[PDB]
């Protein structure tokens, strides 16, 4: 990977999970299902973050 990215050559990975492909083949179903699961996990994580607030941030600054 070093001989590769010695000329920057930023490695690429799929970020096309926000395009929200319209009704099509099974790929549309897969994207919708994975986006739903990502959304549920995001809900859980952010509500968990706001359960305690920024006390952890205050401790980090201290």
């Amino acid at each position: 990977v070093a001989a590769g990215k010695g000329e920057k050559l930023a490695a690429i990975d799929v970020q096309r999970y926000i395009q929200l492909k319209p009704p099509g083949t099974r790929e549309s179903l897969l994207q919708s299902a994975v986006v739903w699961e990502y959304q549920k996990s995001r809900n859980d994580n952010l509500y968990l973050l706001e359960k305690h607030g920024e006390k952890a941030f205050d401790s980090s600054l201290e």
Binding site: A11, D13, A33, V34, E37, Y38
Partner: protein, 131 residues
């Protein structure tokens, strides 16, 4: 070694004095942190109810060939797809079991109605036979 929790081979099997069953120490400790009660017997459980045990470890598959190795995302996508399919099938099981429950309710209701029919018709037939 057949772990009753997922089916995967447990690398740290444990035993229980009240009812020995295969779990992992970290998961049962975390559950007791959530709810300090025995899930099966509905009785209070403490942190000292488990005895230490030794384990012999296992092997790993260690994928070779080191080519930009982005397959992690595809495996992740497969994992969420599997859990989404299982959630859909949870929904299907709930719907089907409720439909069966309702169908059973009306089946037994119809049995009552048709047995009222039977008793009345048999009484009529036997009385007219007596006549």
């Amino acid at each position: 070694m057949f772990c009753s929790i997922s089916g995967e081979t447990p690398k740290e099997p444990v035993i229980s004095r009240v009812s020995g069953n295969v779990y992992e120490k970290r998961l049962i400790e975390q559950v007791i942190r959530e709810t300090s009660k025995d899930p099966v017997t509905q009785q209070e459980c403490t942190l000292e109810d488990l005895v230490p045990v030794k384990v012999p470890d296992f092997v790993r598959p260690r994928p070779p060939s080191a080519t930009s190795l982005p397959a992690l995302l595809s495996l992740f996508q497969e994992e969420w797809d599997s859990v989404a399919l299982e959630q859909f099938e949870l929904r299907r099981n709930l719907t089907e079991t409720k439909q069966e429950l309702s169908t059973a309710l009306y089946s037994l209701d119809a049995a009552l109605r048709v047995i009222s029919r039977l008793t009345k018709e048999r009484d009529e037939a036997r009385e007219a036979l007596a006549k």
